[PDB]
Structures are given as structure tokens and as C-alpha cells.
GROMACS .gro file of C-alpha atoms in nm:
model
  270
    1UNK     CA    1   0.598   4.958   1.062
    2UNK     CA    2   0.850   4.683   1.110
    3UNK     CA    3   1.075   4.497   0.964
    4UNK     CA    4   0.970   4.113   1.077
    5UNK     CA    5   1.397   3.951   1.047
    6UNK     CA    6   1.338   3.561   1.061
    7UNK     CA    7   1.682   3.438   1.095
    8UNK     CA    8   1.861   3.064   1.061
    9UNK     CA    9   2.173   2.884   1.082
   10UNK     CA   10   2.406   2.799   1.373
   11UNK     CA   11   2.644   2.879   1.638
   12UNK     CA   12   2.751   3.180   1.430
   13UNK     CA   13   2.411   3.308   1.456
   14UNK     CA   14   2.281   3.170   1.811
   15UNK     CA   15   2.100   3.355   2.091
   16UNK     CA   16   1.885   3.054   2.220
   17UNK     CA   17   1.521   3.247   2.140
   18UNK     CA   18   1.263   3.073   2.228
   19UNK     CA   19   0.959   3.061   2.043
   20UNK     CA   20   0.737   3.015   2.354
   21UNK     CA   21   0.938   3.336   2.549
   22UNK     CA   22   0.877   3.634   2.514
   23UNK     CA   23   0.794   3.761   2.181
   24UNK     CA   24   0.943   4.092   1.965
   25UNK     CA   25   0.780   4.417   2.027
   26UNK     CA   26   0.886   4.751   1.995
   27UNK     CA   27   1.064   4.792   2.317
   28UNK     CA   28   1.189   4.422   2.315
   29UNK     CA   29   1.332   4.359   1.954
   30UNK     CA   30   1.491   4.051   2.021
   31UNK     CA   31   1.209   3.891   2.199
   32UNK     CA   32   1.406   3.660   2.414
   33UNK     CA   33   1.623   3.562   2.593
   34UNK     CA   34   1.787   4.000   2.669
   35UNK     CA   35   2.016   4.114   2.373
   36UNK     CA   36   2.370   3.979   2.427
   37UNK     CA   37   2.296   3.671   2.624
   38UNK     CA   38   2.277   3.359   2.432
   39UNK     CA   39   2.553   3.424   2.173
   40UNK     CA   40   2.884   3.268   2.104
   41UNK     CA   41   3.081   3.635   2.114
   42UNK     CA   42   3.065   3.744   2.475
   43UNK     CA   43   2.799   3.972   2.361
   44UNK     CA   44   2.553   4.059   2.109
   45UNK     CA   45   2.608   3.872   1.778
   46UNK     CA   46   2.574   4.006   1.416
   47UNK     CA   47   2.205   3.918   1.447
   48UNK     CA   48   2.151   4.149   1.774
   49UNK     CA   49   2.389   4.416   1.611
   50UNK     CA   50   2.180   4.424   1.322
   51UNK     CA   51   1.878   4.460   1.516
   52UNK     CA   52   1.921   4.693   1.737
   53UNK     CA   53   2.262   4.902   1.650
   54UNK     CA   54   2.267   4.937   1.300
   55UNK     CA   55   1.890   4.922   1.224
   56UNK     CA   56   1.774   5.221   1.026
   57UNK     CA   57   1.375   5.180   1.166
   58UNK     CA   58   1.221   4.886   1.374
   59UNK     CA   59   1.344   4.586   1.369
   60UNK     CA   60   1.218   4.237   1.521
   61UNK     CA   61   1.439   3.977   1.569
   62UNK     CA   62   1.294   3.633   1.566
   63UNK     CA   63   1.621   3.386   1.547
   64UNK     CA   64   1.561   3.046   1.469
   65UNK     CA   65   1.946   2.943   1.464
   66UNK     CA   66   2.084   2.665   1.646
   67UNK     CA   67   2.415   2.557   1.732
   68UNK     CA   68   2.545   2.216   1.569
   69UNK     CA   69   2.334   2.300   1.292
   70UNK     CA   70   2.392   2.179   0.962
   71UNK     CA   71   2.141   2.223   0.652
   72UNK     CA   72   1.957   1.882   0.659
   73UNK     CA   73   2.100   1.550   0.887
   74UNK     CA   74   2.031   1.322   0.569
   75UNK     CA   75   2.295   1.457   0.414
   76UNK     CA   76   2.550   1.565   0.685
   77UNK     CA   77   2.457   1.507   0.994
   78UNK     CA   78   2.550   1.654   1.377
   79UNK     CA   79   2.273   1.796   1.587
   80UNK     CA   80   1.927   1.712   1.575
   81UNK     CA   81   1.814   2.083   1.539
   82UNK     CA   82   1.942   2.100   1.163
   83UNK     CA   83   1.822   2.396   0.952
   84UNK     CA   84   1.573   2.192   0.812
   85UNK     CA   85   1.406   2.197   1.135
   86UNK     CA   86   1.445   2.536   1.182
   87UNK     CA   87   1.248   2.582   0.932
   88UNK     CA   88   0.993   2.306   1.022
   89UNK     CA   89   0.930   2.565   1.350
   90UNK     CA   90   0.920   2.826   1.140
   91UNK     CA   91   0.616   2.653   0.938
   92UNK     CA   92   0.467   2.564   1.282
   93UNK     CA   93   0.485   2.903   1.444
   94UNK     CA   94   0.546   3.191   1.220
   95UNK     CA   95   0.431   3.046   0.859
   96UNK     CA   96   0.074   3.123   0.897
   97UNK     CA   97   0.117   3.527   1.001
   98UNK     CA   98  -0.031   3.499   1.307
   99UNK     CA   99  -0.132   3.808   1.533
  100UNK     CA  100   0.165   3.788   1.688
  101UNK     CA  101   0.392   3.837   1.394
  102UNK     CA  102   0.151   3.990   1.132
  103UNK     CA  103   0.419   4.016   0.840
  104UNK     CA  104   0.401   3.968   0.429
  105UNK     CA  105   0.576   4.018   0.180
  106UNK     CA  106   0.698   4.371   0.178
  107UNK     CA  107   0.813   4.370   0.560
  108UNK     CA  108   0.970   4.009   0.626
  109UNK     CA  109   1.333   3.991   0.565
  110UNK     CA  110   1.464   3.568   0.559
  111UNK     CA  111   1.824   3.561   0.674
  112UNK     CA  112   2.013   3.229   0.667
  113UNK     CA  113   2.397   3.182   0.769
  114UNK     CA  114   2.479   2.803   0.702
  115UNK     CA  115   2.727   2.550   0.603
  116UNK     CA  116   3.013   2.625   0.882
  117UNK     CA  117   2.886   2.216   0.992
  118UNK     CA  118   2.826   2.055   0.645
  119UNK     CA  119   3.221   2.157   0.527
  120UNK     CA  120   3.397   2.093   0.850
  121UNK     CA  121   3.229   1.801   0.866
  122UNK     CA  122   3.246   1.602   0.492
  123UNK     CA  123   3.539   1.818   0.335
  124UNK     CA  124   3.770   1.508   0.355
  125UNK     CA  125   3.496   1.276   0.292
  126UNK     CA  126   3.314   1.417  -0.001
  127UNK     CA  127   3.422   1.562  -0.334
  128UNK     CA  128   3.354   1.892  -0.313
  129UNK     CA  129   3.216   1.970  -0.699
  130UNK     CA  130   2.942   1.700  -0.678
  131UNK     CA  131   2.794   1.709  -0.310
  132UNK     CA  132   2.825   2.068  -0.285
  133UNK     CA  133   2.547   2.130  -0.538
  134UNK     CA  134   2.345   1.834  -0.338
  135UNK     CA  135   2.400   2.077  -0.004
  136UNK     CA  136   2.267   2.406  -0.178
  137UNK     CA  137   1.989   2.225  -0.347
  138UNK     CA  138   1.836   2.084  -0.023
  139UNK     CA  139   1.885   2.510   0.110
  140UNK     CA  140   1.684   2.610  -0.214
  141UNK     CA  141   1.403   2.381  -0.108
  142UNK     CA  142   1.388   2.473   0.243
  143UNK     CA  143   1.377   2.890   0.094
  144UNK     CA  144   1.103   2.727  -0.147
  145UNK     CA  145   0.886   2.695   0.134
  146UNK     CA  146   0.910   2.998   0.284
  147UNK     CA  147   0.855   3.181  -0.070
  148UNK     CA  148   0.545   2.980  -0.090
  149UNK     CA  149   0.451   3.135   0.288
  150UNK     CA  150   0.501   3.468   0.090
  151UNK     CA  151   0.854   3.553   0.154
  152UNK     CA  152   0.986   3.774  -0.123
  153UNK     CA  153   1.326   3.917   0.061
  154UNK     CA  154   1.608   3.691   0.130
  155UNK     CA  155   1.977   3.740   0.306
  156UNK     CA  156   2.246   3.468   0.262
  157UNK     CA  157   2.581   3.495   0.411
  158UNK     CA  158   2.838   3.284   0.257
  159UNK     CA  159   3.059   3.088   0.470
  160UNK     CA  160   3.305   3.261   0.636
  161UNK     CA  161   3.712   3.099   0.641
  162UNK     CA  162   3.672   2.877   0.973
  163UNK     CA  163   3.962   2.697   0.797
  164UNK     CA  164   4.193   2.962   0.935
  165UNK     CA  165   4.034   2.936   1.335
  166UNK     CA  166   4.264   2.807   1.573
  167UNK     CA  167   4.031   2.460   1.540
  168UNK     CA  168   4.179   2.399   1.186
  169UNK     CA  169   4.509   2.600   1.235
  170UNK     CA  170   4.625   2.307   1.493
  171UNK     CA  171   4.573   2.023   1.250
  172UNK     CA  172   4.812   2.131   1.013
  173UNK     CA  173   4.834   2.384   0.673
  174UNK     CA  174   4.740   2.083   0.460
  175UNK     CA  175   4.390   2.050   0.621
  176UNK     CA  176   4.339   2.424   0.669
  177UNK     CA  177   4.411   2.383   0.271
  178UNK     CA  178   4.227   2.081   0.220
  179UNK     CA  179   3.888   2.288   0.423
  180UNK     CA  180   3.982   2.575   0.210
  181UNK     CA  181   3.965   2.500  -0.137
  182UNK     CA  182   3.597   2.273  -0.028
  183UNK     CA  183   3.480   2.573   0.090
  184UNK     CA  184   3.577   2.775  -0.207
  185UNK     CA  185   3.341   2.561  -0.409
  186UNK     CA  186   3.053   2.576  -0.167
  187UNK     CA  187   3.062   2.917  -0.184
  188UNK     CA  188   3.042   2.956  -0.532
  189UNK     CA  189   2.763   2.712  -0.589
  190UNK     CA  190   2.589   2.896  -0.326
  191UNK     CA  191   2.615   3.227  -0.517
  192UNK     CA  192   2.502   3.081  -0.843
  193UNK     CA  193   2.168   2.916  -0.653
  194UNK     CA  194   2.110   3.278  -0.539
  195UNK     CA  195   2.122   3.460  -0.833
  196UNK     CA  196   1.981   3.177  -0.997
  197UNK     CA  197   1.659   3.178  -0.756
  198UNK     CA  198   1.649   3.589  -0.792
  199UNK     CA  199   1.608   3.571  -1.185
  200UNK     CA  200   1.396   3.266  -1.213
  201UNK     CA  201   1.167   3.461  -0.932
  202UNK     CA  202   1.167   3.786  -1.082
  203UNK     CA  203   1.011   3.897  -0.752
  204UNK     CA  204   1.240   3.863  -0.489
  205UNK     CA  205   1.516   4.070  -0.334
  206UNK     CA  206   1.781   3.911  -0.244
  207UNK     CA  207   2.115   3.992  -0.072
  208UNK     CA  208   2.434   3.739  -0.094
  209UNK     CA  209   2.709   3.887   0.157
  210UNK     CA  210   3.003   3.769   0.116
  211UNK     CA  211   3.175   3.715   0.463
  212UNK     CA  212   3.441   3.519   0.337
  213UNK     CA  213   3.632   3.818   0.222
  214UNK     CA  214   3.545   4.074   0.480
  215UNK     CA  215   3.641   3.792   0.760
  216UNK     CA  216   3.980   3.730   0.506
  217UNK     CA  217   4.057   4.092   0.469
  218UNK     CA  218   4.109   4.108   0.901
  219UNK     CA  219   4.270   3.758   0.921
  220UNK     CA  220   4.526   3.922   0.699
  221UNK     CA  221   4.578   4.233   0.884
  222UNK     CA  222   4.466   4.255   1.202
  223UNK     CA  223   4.661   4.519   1.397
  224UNK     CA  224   4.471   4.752   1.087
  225UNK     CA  225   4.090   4.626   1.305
  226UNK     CA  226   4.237   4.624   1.631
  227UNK     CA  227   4.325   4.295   1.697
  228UNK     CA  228   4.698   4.192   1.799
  229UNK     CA  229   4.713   3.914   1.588
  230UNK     CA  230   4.497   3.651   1.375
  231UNK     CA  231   4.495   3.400   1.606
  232UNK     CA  232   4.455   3.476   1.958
  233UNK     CA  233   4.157   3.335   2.179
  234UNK     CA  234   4.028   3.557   2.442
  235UNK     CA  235   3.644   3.470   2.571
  236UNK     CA  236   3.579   3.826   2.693
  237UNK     CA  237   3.520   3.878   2.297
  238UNK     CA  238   3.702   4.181   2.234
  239UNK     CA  239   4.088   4.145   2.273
  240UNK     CA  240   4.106   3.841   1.985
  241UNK     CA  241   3.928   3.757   1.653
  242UNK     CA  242   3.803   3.448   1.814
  243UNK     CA  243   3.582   3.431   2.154
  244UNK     CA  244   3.716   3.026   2.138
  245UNK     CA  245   3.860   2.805   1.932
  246UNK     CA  246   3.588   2.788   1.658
  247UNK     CA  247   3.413   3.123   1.673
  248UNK     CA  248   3.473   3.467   1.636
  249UNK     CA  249   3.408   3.748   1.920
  250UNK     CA  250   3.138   4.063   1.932
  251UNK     CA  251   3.398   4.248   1.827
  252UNK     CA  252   3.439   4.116   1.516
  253UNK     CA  253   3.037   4.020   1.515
  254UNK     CA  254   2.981   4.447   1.528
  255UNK     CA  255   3.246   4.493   1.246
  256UNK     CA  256   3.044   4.237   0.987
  257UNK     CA  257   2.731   4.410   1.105
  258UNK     CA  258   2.844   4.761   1.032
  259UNK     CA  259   2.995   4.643   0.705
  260UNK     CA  260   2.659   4.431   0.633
  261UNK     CA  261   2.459   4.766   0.689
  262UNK     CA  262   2.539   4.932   0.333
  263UNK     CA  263   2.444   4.617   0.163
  264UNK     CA  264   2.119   4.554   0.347
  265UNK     CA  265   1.948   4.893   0.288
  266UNK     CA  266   1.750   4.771  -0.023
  267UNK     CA  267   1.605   4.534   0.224
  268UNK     CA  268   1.417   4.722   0.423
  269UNK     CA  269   1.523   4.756   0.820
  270UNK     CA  270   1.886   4.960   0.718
   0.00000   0.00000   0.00000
């Protein structure tokens, strides 16, 4: 009996699966391409950690994230697989419950991480409190057509403070601010579409985790997780926060995960 974890979003969330490689089973959770390859960590990512570390019965991983991704490139634009079209695949492959991936509605768990792109790149372009709500409005339509598949169990992460990676620390505290407070509003217009969408459902279940402050809490005292400091880069993913410039390390990945676990038990797979 498992849990069928259709995942979306970015280079946060990455492992390069393939939807024409090899596909989930039992002994093979992630599918493709081997659990820890693909990632931008060094290792496995919160997706594979999830999976196959702090999964409380079988889990399948089929993850539909993409890096450059932002939620749809009419309204901010960078690569060409945007989370729109991650979902688009998911409609072309997975939609239909095929053999392969025989889920409904009490067994398929909709995880999307997204909007890292969209604020770094229109938060000194846009204003915040009125294109915000235009970004989480085009996400509610994309989940609208997977709750019309028959998806009743959802999982958004908020947006996590990339304004404080070495990327944004080098251009100066007033951008790091200026990322910050557009963030601050995304966030909170995300929250309110999720709740929103739960009660005017009445049928979902629906986790928001809120990554911003667990990420926040070891930016602001790192020694206390590990880490020497809050912004050191090291690539083998373990010895800094970040694996580069822009992206945090399987270290930190397996910390969100096993703080993420708690929170995801009424979903089914922890």
C-alpha cells in the first residue's frame, strides 16, 4: 500500500527523474535516476530524504521538479520547464492512473516547493502586494487541475530566505532587504490561498510548511546545527549551509526533512 508522492518545483527540489526511466517500485522508490544523484546538495535532497529516510511505510517518489523553474513563464519567466509544465507532464503521464502508478485519492500526496525564481527574479520590478496574489492565483489553478484528476492531499512549502544566500548577501543589505520584505508578502498570500483552498474544499488535506522559519532559525545560529557559520560554501554538502552560492547542502536538506516528518504524518507516508 503506497503512498504515490508527485512532487514539483525547482532546483530546491531537483533529481532529474525521468518519466521515461525507470519507474518507482518497492525496491526502487525514487524511480530514477539512483537516490542522491541528480540533486543540488551533494546528496539526497529533502525529496529523497523524505522518501526513503524518514518515510513511515512505502513511499514512491515521482519528482517532476525542474531547475530554473518558476510557476508559469507568462508571468515571470526563466526556463522553459516552468511549473506549469510540470504539471502539463503530469496530465500527460500520471493524470489518468495508469497501471503504472495506480493511485486515488486516499494514497497520492501533491507536493509543490515554488517561488525561489518568481521573487529573485521581479522583487525590484514588481510591487509585491498586487503581483504576488497574480503568482499564487496562477499555483491555485495549476492544483485545480490536479484536484479535478482526484487529488485530495496537498504539501506546500513556503519559500525559504534565499535573500540571506551568499547570491544576495554580495549585492548588498539593501537588496537582501529589498528580496526580504517581497518575500514576506508572497508568503503570506500563499498561506491564505491554502487555507483558503482547504475550507472552500472541505475535502482536502493539506499541509503548509513553513521553511522560512526553520531555514531562519539555523541562519541565526548555526554552530547550535553544526555548521561553522551562516555563510560558508562548501560543495561536498555537509561542512556549510550552502552546497553553492544559491542552494543549501544535504545536510541541511536531512534537517528540513526530519523536521517536515512530524507535520506530514496526517498525510499518509510519515
Amino acid at each position: 500500500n503506497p503512498t504515490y508522492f508527485f512532487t514539483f518545483g525547482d532546483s530546491y527540489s531537483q533529481t532529474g527523474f525521468s518519466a521515461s526511466g525507470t519507474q518507482p517500485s518497492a525496491s526502487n522508490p525514487m524511480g530514477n535516476p539512483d537516490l542522491g544523484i541528480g540533486t543540488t546538495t551533494n546528496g539526497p535532497n529533502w525529496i529523497g530524504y523524505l522518501t526513503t529516510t524518514e518515510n513511515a511505510s512505502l513511499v514512491l517518489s515521482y519528482n517532476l521538479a525542474a531547475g530554473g523553474a518558476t510557476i508559469d513563464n507568462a508571468l515571470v519567466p526563466f526556463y522553459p520547464g516552468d511549473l506549469a509544465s510540470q504539471f502539463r507532464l503530469f496530465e500527460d503521464v500520471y493524470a489518468d492512473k495508469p497501471a503504472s502508478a495506480p493511485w486515488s485519492a486516499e494514497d497520492a500526496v501533491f507536493g509543490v516547493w515554488i517561488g525561489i525564481n518568481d521573487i529573485g527574479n521581479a522583487y525590484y520590478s514588481t510591487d509585491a502586494e498586487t503581483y504576488t496574489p497574480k503568482l499564487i492565483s496562477r499555483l491555485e489553478s495549476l492544483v485545480e487541475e490536479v484536484y479535478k484528476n482526484g487529488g485530495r492531499k496537498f504539501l506546500f512549502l513556503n519559500v525559504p530566505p534565499t535573500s540571506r544566500s551568499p547570491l544576495f548577501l554580495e549585492q548588498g543589505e539593501e537588496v537582501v532587504k529589498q528580496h526580504a520584505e517581497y518575500l514576506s508578502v508572497y508568503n503570506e498570500n500563499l498561506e491564505g490561498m491554502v487555507d483558503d483552498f482547504t475550507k472552500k474544499k472541505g475535502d482536502v488535506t493539506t499541509v503548509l510548511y513553513d521553511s522560512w522559519s526553520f531555514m531562519t532559525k539555523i541562519l541565526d545560529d548555526p554552530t547550535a546545527y553544526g555548521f561553522p557559520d551562516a555563510t560558508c560554501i562548501n560543495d561536498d554538502g555537509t561542512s556549510c549551509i550552502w552546497w553553492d552560492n544559491y542552494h543549501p547542502g544535504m545536510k541541511y536538506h536531512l534537517l528540513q526533512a526530519e523536521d517536515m516528518k512530524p507535520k506530514l504524518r496526517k498525510l499518509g507516508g510519515w
